[PDB]
Amino acid sequence: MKQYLDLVRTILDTGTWQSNGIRTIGIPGAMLRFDLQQGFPAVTTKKLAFKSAIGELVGFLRATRSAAEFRALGCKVWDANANENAQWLANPYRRGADDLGDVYGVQWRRWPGYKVLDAHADAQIADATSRGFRIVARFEEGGADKVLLHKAIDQLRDCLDTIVRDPSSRRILFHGWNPAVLDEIALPACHLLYQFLPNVERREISLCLYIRSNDVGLGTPFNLAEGAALLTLVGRLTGYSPRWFTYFIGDAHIYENQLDMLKQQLEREPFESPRLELAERVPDYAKTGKYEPQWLERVEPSDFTLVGYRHH
Amino acid sequence: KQYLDLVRTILDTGTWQRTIGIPGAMLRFDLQQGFPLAFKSAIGELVGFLRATRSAAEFRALGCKVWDANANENAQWLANPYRRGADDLGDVYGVQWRRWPGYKVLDAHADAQIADATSRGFRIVARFEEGGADKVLLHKAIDQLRDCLDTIVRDPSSRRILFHGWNPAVLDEIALPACHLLYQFLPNVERREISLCLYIRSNDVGLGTPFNLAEGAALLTLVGRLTGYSPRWFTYFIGDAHIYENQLDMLKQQSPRLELAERVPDYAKTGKYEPQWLERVEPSDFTLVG
């Protein structure tokens, strides 16, 4: 995690000050890159809220849009956004208490995809239905008969399928930035795009994660934990050992009211990284040869544990 | 230098499959210091994307031949029922950047949602019954890029100024899915500097990288001109970074200035917002001197 502390130092030494209530100091474009075989990228100069981060990831895997369900998973980080944020409270897409809208995992697992086809475009219709689209309406437009097709697209499960079927593919990615629904949600995706990169020779799998915006103090440690944990779960279910986790940040910044806290962290002696264990009950595809992607839903926060986590 | 270090790293630590590659790389360039047939082809591609082009012929007229084979020789695409005919590519890249087909299915009596959607440019295009409920289908052709330019001028402290070309609903309707995928602009209002982060899912570090760098730098230069900001950082994030075996000879062996024509007006000098220059700009407006 030296790279993390070095990022903080770089922002403080080379960043510029900006207003937005609380000022931030930031740089555009940074990378952290971790070899997960060397350890899990937990901050040690403070306590990582590991169970909260794992709870959040499990929530996303389950396409959760309720802060109550996040809370049941050990994660309170959505409560204010769901229930106090004035702009969200005024948003007509908010269903009521604890609702977040179709954030993050809803887009990962259930992206609402539509096609509008000519009603007699038989080959297009057959192709779309073969891929899981279904006809939900027939209507006239411009004096032409149309069909609306819909699919709740499970990008993440599609990625796991491609890893097992076609690991040399350079298209194994999902993301949560759906322009059609930016106006319907509590918060737009901060951690945005996830790309998996299997290595057949080495039986290794890597992850590149694009982050639109991070509070480097409070957010980066949480998102590191979640991305590393996701890669570990995906490797378990697809027969690959997790290897490189590359974390790409667009707007990397630090809030002015965190400076004192962060400065004290920069002075502390970091500890060796811990190791992440994913519970034996989550079956290993490399051992079983049984493909069981339902474990994306069946995994619980308690299946993720850190071994040897030392921290200040 | 950064570029050659990436090359060295791939060659020394990559895995063969022929191509040799690593996962996750970054190049980061200060465009104020300098620019990072090839150039004109890249510019022609960019102008084609800006104009939401789906025809290889239109790309060729703009000086770009790189789409012909994918339009007309790729067996999978030739068999695809969404292909209209010769030179068609489907709604690739710029069509998503400029005219992303955004849909909502709302309850017909969700007045406040429907009103909100209409205020944002959605229109009701169909009414139908599903699951015993009366529903309305709303549609907007979302111009993500224009929305970005508007936000740069209106609210530059926004950290949401980005567009991309990866629309999961149409991956089955297109000649190739977006490779240079996500573009994020980062205005710094205190310094009137604008930066760009670009995520590329797959890149030939030999011939692909120079091409994509030209297009990204050109786009940041155009956007800065039209929004009142000087280009600064261009950060280039790569997922699958690889080199072809057939290029090793060439790579084993191995700045100019970008100019955008003065006829493309500078918002910082005119005070007149003219985002229509995204369509009016021509390949000839971009030159690479030195």
Side-chain angles (χ1 to χ4, degrees), chain A residues 1-139 141-202 204-262 265-268 270-271 273-279 281-289 291-312, chain B residues 2-7 9-16 18-36 38-248 251 255-258 260-290:
Chain A
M1 290 289 286
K2 183 186 169 41
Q3 299 167 64
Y4 169 73
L5 297 179
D6 291 353
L7 176 57
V8 170
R9 290 191 185 90
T10 289
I11 294 172
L12 298 177
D13 294 351
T14 71
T16 57
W17 284 106
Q18 302 209 70
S19 310
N20 47 78
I22 304 278
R23 293 201 307 167
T24 60
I25 183 156
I27 71 184
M31 178 185 76
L32 299 171
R33 186 165 183 272
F34 297 103
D35 178 349
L36 290 189
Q37 295 199 347
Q38 304 187 293
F40 182 83
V43 293
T44 71
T45 56
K46 68 168 186 185
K47 188 188 125 158
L48 173 69
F50 174 79
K51 291 188 293 189
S52 185
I54 291 294
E56 194 180 36
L57 170 64
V58 165
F60 297 154
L61 293 175
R62 301 179 181 183
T64 302
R65 67 179 273 177
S66 170
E69 288 165 5
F70 280 109
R71 284 192 306 269
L73 286 164
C75 178
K76 302 176 163 305
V77 311
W78 286 97
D79 293 356
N81 276 109
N83 300 312
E84 183 187 309
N85 186 286
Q87 173 177 49
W88 178 241
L89 287 172
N91 186 310
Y93 296 94
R94 179 184 177 275
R95 289 176 180 167
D98 289 317
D99 192 39
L100 301 172
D102 289 337
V103 301
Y104 285 116
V106 181
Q107 299 309 311
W108 303 356
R109 313 295 318 265
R110 302 186 185 208
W111 175 295
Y114 296 98
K115 299 185 189 303
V116 175
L117 306 180
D118 190 276
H120 301 287
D122 280 11
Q124 289 174 9
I125 292 166
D127 189 69
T129 64
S130 80
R131 302 182 193 282
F133 287 83
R134 297 285 180 273
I135 300 164
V136 296
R138 279 142 198 110
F139 61 99
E141 181 173 34
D145 295 294
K146 311 292 199 177
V147 290
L148 180 65
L149 287 83
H150 167 259
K151 183 175 170 192
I153 299 165
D154 192 343
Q155 301 180 78
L156 176 58
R157 193 162 166 150
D158 286 347
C159 284
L160 272 70
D161 287 355
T162 301
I163 297 157
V164 168
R165 174 192 73 253
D166 185 21
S168 72
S169 172
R170 289 153 176 153
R171 296 172 186 191
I172 311 176
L173 64 89
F174 67 90
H175 70 76
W177 192 265
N178 181 353
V181 303
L182 294 167
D183 49 340
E184 304 185 23
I185 58 177
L187 193 70
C190 291
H191 48 102
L192 202 157
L193 185 151
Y194 292 71
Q195 179 178 0
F196 298 100
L197 302 96
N199 181 320
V200 177
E201 172 191 284
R202 303 183 68 78
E204 285 173 358
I205 187 168
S206 297
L207 173 59
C208 293
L209 169 49
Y210 182 90
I211 311 294
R212 157 182 77 70
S213 178
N214 247 187
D215 173 342
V216 174
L218 298 183
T220 297
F222 212 82
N223 296 138
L224 291 173
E226 291 182 32
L230 179 58
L231 180 58
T232 304
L233 176 58
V234 168
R236 174 72 64 80
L237 302 172
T238 62
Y240 292 87
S241 300
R243 186 76 195 290
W244 294 105
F245 174 34
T246 304
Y247 192 83
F248 292 134
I249 316 178
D251 191 321
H253 55 265
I254 289 169
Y255 283 91
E256 187 155 32
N257 61 0
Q258 283 176 53
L259 280 174
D260 280 11
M261 180 185 183
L262 291 163
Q265 275 180 68
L266 289 173
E267 306 310 295
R268 291 163 154 188
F271 288 98
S273 296
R275 286 188 16 259
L276 176 62
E277 290 203 346
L278 176 60
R281 72 168 201 124
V282 189
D284 191 333
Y285 181 68
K287 291 176 171 164
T288 64
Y291 181 49
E292 304 185 81
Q294 63 267 33
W295 280 91
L296 297 177
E297 289 80 40
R298 298 176 40 61
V299 70
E300 301 281 3
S302 65
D303 292 318
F304 300 85
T305 64
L306 295 179
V307 181
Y309 180 45
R310 304 177 183 264
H311 66 98
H312 288 270
Chain B
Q2 277 181 75
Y3 178 74
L4 294 187
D5 287 320
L6 178 55
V7 172
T9 292
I10 292 169
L11 294 188
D12 284 344
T13 80
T15 303
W16 279 108
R18 290 213 307 163
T19 57
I20 177 161
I22 65 175
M26 173 182 74
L27 296 171
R28 181 164 188 274
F29 300 102
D30 183 356
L31 298 185
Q32 171 67 19
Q33 298 208 302
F35 178 85
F39 173 77
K40 279 288 170 198
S41 186
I43 296 302
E45 184 174 87
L46 172 57
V47 172
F49 292 165
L50 296 174
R51 298 180 183 183
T53 308
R54 62 182 277 175
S55 166
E58 293 173 2
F59 281 107
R60 290 193 296 276
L62 293 166
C64 177
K65 298 169 83 170
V66 307
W67 284 101
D68 294 3
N70 280 107
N72 298 314
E73 292 191 265
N74 184 278
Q76 259 191 286
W77 175 238
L78 289 164
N80 185 306
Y82 299 92
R83 180 177 183 274
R84 295 180 170 166
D87 289 324
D88 190 38
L89 291 168
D91 286 334
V92 300
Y93 282 105
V95 178
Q96 299 309 311
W97 297 358
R98 310 302 314 271
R99 301 178 193 172
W100 179 291
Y103 296 98
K104 306 182 190 295
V105 174
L106 305 180
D107 191 274
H109 311 292
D111 300 344
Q113 291 175 10
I114 295 165
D116 189 71
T118 295
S119 79
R120 293 179 199 288
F122 287 80
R123 288 300 181 270
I124 291 165
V125 300
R127 292 176 178 273
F128 64 96
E129 188 177 5
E130 172 178 46
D134 299 302
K135 302 273 213 181
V136 286
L137 177 64
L138 282 81
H139 164 262
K140 180 178 166 184
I142 295 161
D143 191 341
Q144 301 179 75
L145 177 54
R146 169 61 187 284
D147 286 346
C148 292
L149 269 67
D150 292 346
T151 300
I152 290 158
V153 169
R154 170 193 78 258
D155 185 25
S157 75
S158 178
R159 304 194 180 97
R160 299 154 186 199
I161 312 180
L162 74 89
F163 71 91
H164 71 76
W166 191 274
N167 182 351
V170 306
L171 291 170
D172 59 337
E173 309 190 14
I174 58 183
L176 206 47
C179 196
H180 52 91
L181 195 158
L182 185 146
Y183 296 74
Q184 178 170 8
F185 302 100
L186 299 99
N188 180 326
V189 75
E190 294 77 8
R191 307 177 88 68
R192 300 299 288 267
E193 293 177 1
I194 190 170
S195 298
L196 172 62
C197 290
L198 176 49
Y199 186 88
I200 309 295
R201 66 172 173 84
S202 191
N203 220 188
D204 176 7
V205 174
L207 293 180
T209 298
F211 185 97
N212 294 115
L213 289 173
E215 180 224 295
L219 173 62
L220 184 54
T221 303
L222 175 63
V223 175
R225 180 65 66 77
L226 299 178
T227 65
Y229 288 79
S230 58
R232 190 76 202 281
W233 291 109
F234 174 23
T235 303
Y236 186 77
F237 300 125
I238 312 160
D240 191 317
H242 58 265
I243 285 170
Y244 286 89
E245 183 156 41
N246 56 43
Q247 287 179 54
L248 288 167
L251 288 170
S255 82
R257 174 170 34 119
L258 182 65
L260 173 65
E262 294 195 330
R263 77 167 195 122
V264 183
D266 186 344
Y267 177 66
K269 306 180 163 314
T270 66
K272 186 171 160 32
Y273 188 44
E274 296 182 70
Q276 54 266 29
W277 276 95
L278 297 175
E279 288 82 33
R280 299 181 58 192
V281 72
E282 295 284 356
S284 63
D285 290 321
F286 299 87
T287 55
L288 196 56
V289 189

